[PDB]
Structure 1
């Protein structure tokens, strides 16, 4: 009876036992299906492939991310990767111990109900509970106060927290980064004549975004530092072995986070939406928030993301006030680290909802 904690994070899905610095299974969430006729009468093949099992054989497969923007669109597949994650990958019987379940702040409640559902009547679990993406970033980072920033592939949001008292009216969820950053990248790369568009190749694109993006850090002279002289163009061999040439859009793709007029969806931009989240907070409360903003999203490894937020957030706010963006490298597992902390420790053991409670009222109880 030890806690295992899993996440919905689209992208990679991450699950492991309580009391550990990293989950035992980290694999992308995909339900793949063959788009071609079976020749191998060898029925050793499968209906569909999930995770790395699918991620290994790609161009053959078609790829469906079940987690759209934090909301989960397709349930039938989604239960499979859970059905997998409990059995293969990390190998556990479905009934041992409860599970803390990561989940999105502002998403529709109908998300978490069917999800609490299929954690019971299909395969019964010794209770359950569902926390929020951000609230576990502090249990991980150990802070009590402070605003967060979370992105990941599922959705980008920030949840200012002070002494474990949330400020829900200030929670700002703008859906961006994540997948939507590649879909701009597949869009932009055609500048150099690379036509990448198919469901299976998309990840080949992503592994560019992984390797070289960073953040422009005042990309005015940066484009001119790209345009005029070329020192920053790097080449990336791709699974066939052919060279790719880049560097005008290397920084330019993540730059869209600060000007979503590149991607075309017009809302805010991520740097000041934290500010425009702070301003909605109280006058008193905000002094330390500027110092404590953690920015652990799981997207942002960009070498110089934090460095530009420093520049941009100081351009906002009164300059007399010290702002500190902590960028711990152990993030991208952070939201999971909180699980292996929160559920591991106690005073939470009565915060689970047992199958009783689901028999008590119903799925509506989690709210």
Structure 2
């Protein structure tokens, strides 16, 4: 077998290669008690790690080890990795090569340091760093197409033609679900609800994941929000506070579509996908539109595929049909790709050997792989 770990923003996905679903899914967060605790008999547990933190979220000040695809603190990451290897997985790092999945156009330092820690901190005979766009494509099972990969951290687009890649054509977008969460918390304050702490910051994100959805037309729902009946729902916090939201829930996911509310010049997700297509060769463009694949955590909300289809069809030529494939559990597709990627016979030869690292050096990662 083999070990596959996804070190994405906010969540750490771990599991075994060859398995359709990972063994360990839990937030990558460390929570500590900001305020002195009052009670008798408490163990006073100074540090909380994993899903335990989620239950005791209000008192704890949550900290994310990974910001914008960059890890702020290395020791916290080790605790996370330790937790995945010896808790839910119940396996030793020594036992198998470890596969890590990285987003496109990611900085050089992240690959070199990540490999260095895996070779030094957790001793393993070999390791490989994968690219999220190609792995998602394998889950799709399609040889040719354009892949828009939006993670919890940074949205990336990577077109592919029959296995050949176009690095110029790949476009990185700075709009993501986490950004939406910050916009969302900012929008709540005008209404009269204010969240200024990281621990309750997750609470708005939780609201966004199931309560929020994407409107067929933004202006019409706002117009009909005056007489809202089914537009408002009550969310119950573990704390016991009650939250009622209306037109507010659908205008949040809208921002990816309409960056103007955010205040940034950069175009929305449908325009960016279009831009990536323009970068690509004209001959391969025609099946790019009909082979569009959606992936990542922020593509979960219903109606995204339908809104994207009409918008791409209107902007693009009408001479060909536009097809978008958006399968469920696309959020976990990146991890899944890692497990499938390590399952190919050709791939095992490709892993970065310890010997090669020792001779050539850390800088060989870019040389060996994309």
What is the TM-score when the length of structure 1 is the normalising length?
0.94
Deviation at 1:330, TM superposition (A): 2.9
Paired residues in the alignment total 366
Residue 207 (structure 1) shift? 1.2
Kept in 2: contact 1:11–1:152 (CA 8 A): no
**Deviation sequence 1:242-282 (CA, Å, 0-9, x none):** 33221211110000001112222331111110001101111
Shift of 1:75: 2.0
3-state SS of the aligned residue for 1:225? Answer: helix
Structure 2 Cα separation of the partners of residues 60 and 316 of structure 1: 49
SS of 1:294 mapped into structure 2: strand
Distance 1:49 1:265, change over 3 A: farther
Kindly indicate which of the two structures has a greater share of residues assigned to helix. Answer: 2
The answer (yes or no) to whether the contact 1:186–1:205 under 8 Å persists in 2 is yes
For the structure 1 residues 349 and 235, does the alpha-carbon distance in structure 2 shift closer, same or farther, using more than 3 Å as the test?
same
> How high is the TM-score relative to the length of structure 2?
0.94
Q: Is 2:14–2:23's contact at 8 Å kept on the other side of the alignment? A: yes
Q: Cα offset for 1:128?
A: 0.2
Contact 1:134 / 1:158 at 8 angstroms: preserved in 2? yes
Once the two structures are superposed, residues 325-366 of structure 1 have per-residue CA deviations (whole angstroms, 9 ceiling, x without a partner) of 101013111111111111112111101012112212222111
How far residue 68 of structure 1 moved from its aligned partner, in angstroms, is 1.0
Deviates more, 1:105-114 or 1:357-366: 357-366
- The two structures, once aligned, show a CA RMSD in angstroms of 1.9
CA–CA distance in structure 2, aligned partners of residues 224 and 39 of structure 1: 49
Q: Deviation string for 1:154-189 (max 9, x for gaps)?
A: 111111111121221111111222211111111112
Name the structure with the higher strand share.
Answer: 2
CA drift at 1:39: 6.9
Question: CA 1:214/1:142 → structure 2, altered by over 3 Å: closer, same or farther?
Answer: same
Q: Mind listing any 5+ residue stretches in structure 1 that lack a counterpart?
A: none
Offset, 1:241: 3.2
Closer, same or farther in 2 for the Cα pair 1:366/1:40, shift >3 Å? farther
Cα contact 1:79–1:118 (8 A) shared by 2: no
- For residues 276 and 304 of structure 1, what CA distance do their matches in structure 2 show? 22
Structure 2: unaligned runs, 5 residues or longer? none
Deviation, 1:113, is: 0.8
2-structure distance, mates of 1:192, 1:223: 15
CA apart distance, 1:303? 0.9
